[PDB]
Design a protein around this ligand. Structure first.
Ligand SMILES: CSc1ccccc1CN(CCN(CC(=O)O)Cc1cccc(O)c1O)CC(=O)O
Ligand SMILES: [Fe+3]
Length: 498
């Protein structure tokens, strides 16, 4: 069955509620649900469900001209009234979408006609079209599939306009997708897709080698990186490694001792041998990161000065700040307090564990005692929320979230980035400037605000950037070259040709 493929994912795709988050899998939601505008690697958005659009001179009112030939998979039509209902179902659950600023921006959505949709905004929101293009929540399910005329409490059938339809879902075993034969756009060459539920990275690698699955598509945690490096040399397999898509990094808690001292955060940024870490743990498959965002990120080419590996400077910074070595000890003290920092991470993640040891060892050389706290997933998420960490592993989100969306969510208390920065003296000014840069339409001021925000975060050493990571692909040669989706969390199944 060449026109059919089998792949794998750690968990099930979920109920596929377009307006909700976990356990829903973003790649799966983007397979079924579609946006008004499609994000492109160009950095632009192109028409999709909305074939064109105008906006008022103050950029507060937007009128979208939708297509008239788009049906939901069940047969029901997609029109401006359906769109409006979806935005209403979403905005009735507005508080949960606080991370995403557009959900706080939309004042009204109404169908002017069957093909005219009007959206009104609190202000001129620059990232409007980008956040309309996101996998969630602003995508469309058939209003019939609502429950009590809402979606926040669940849906019935995941009926979308996209080129794929969920056909079967047996928990902890598999999910089966089929091609929407009445898809309005172009037909995918593949008809059937099977997602084997395989929670363990090694077990996924083993699954591929035995030929049980035909494709693996994910980030640097897709499969063991030593195994991936081996696959790349195996002429029976095909592998890929995209341009970098996002930053992997440490978040330093500016509100908790001793990471509340700028000198300490600065010294930590000088302490890690990143190239060694990347050669050792990442098997040279990623790039070294010096800044929160790579220079290639929009508005992020600022000429920020890198803090490169310099143990001697790291020591002198600590020495100067009052962190000295007691007699016969390797760990520094100050005011009776030892230089001890808690690095918490998911304990069943071999990569994080492997990255944590190196960091612990590197920072021990500069007189810092790092305590590896490996906990389960839920615990680490809880620490991130409540800001109960010294150091923590963190990720940026890639296009099109970087930089505006990642920056925007720094204002949300529930997020690790707010907690990490909570000890900053300029945290209100930063948060104020983040709100401004989203709503300003002066391009000179926008770049000026982005510079000031990123520079401050850089100059305050809030983060310890480690690497810029890439997308990884492992596939049977028969599938050919596998394209990359413009959005890091999407998997372009509709582009693959067996
Ligand atoms: C579990 S989703 C969610 C719901 C409410 C508040 C926060 C979140 C999770 N994240 C923000 C939302 N999240 C989008 C989403 O999950 O639809 C950001 C995000 C972006 C790209 C890949 C991933 C991801 O979680 C925080 C994070 O991922 O660090
Ligand atoms: Fe998320």
């Amino acid at each position: 069955a060449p026109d059919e493929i089998t792949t794998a994912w750690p968990v099930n795709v979920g109920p596929l509620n377009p307006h909700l988050y976990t356990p829903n899998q973003m790649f799966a939601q983007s397979m079924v649900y579609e946006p008004l505008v499609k994000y492109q690697a160009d950095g632009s958005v192109i028409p999709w469900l909305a074939k064109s659009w105008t906006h008022s001179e103050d950029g507060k009112t937007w009128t979208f001209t939708l297509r008239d030939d788009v049906k939901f998979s069940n047969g029901e039509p997609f029109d401006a009234e359906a769109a409006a209902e979806n935005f209403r179902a979403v905005l009735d659950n507005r508080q949960r979408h606080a991370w995403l600023e557009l959900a706080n921006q939309i004042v009204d959505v109404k169908a002017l006609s069957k093909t005219e949709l009007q959206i009104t905004l609190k202000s001129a929101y620059y990232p409007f079209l980008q956040e309309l293009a996101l996998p969630r929540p602003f995508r469309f399910i058939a209003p019939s599939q609502f429950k009590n005329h809402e979606t926040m409490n669940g849906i019935k059938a995941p009926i979308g306009t996209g080129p794929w339809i969920l056909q079967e879902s047996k928990l902890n075993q598999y999910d089966v997708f089929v091609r929407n034969e009445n898809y309005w756009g172009e037909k995918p060459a593949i008809k059937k897709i099977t997602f084997n539920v395989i929670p363990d990275p090694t077990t996924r690698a083993v699954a591929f080698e035995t030929g049980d699955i035909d494709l693996l598509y994910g980030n640097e945690g897709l499969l063991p990186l030593d195994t991936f490096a081996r696959f790349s040399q195996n002429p029976a397999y095909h592998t890929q490694l995209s341009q970098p898509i996002e930053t992997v990094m440490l978040a330093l808690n500016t509100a908790k001792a001793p990471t509340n001292e700028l000198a300490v955060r600065e010294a930590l940024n000088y302490a890690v041998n990143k190239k060694s870490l990347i050669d050792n743990a990442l098997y040279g498959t990623q790039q070294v990161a010096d800044t929160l965002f790579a220079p290639s990120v929009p508005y992020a080419n600022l000429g920020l000065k890198p803090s490169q590996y310099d143990p001697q400077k790291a020591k002198a910074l600590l020495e100067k700040a009052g962190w000295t070595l007691p007699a016969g000890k390797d760990i520094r003290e100050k005011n009776g307090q030892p230089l001890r920092i808690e690095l918490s991470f998911i304990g069943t993640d071999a990569l994080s564990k492997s990255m944590a040891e190196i960091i612990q060892a590197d920072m021990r050389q500069i007189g810092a005692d790092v305590s590896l706290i490996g906990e389960e997933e839920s615990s680490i998420y809880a620490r991130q929320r409540d800001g109960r960490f010294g150091m923590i592993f963190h990720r940026t989100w890639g296009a099109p979230y970087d930089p505006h969306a990642f920056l925007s969510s720094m204002r949300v208390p529930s997020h690790a980035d707010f907690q990490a920065q909570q000890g900053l003296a300029d945290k209100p000014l930063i948060d104020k400037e983040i709100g401004e840069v989203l709503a300003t339409h002066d391009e000179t001021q926008r770049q000026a605000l982005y510079r000031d925000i990123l520079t401050r975060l850089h100059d305050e050493a809030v983060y310890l950037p480690i690497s810029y990571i890439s997308m990884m692909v492992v596939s049977k040669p028969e599938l050919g070259n596998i394209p990359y989706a413009p959005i890091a969390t999407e998997i372009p199944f509709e582009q693959i040709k067996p």
